[PDB]
Amino acid sequence: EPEITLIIFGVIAGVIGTILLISYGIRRLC
Amino acid sequence: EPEITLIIFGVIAGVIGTILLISYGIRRLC
Numbered sequence: 921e922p923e924i925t926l927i928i929f930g931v932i933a934g935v936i937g938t939i940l941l942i943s944y945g946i947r948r949l950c
Numbered sequence: 951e952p953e954i955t956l957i958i959f960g961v962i963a964g965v966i967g968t969i970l971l972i973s974y975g976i977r978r979l980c
């Protein structure tokens with residue numbers, strides 16, 4: 921039942937969110 | 951409220967997961 925969909929997408933929004941945020945903290949660091 | 955609880959956990963698990971993944975990936979792969 922679609923209760924896991926909230927988890928997977930939350931992970932997706934969690935993984936994507938961290939990669940980009942760190943990539944914006946490193947983009948200056950060459 | 952239970953839906954947002956599942957989504958938030960996905961984010962937290964996603965945030966902690968990605969941080970550890972690349973932190974334990976940068977230092978490893980030299």
Ligand SMILES: CCCCCCCC/C=C\CCCCCCCC(=O)OC[C@@H](O)CO
Nearest residue numbers: 921924927931935960963964966967968971
């Ligand atoms: C950077 C990667 C981050 C990975 C984080 C992974 C987080 C996983 C979080 C939660 C996993 C829960 C797994 C849930 C496992 C479902 C159990 C099951 O099979 O029962 C199904 C029933 O509905 C049948 O009636």
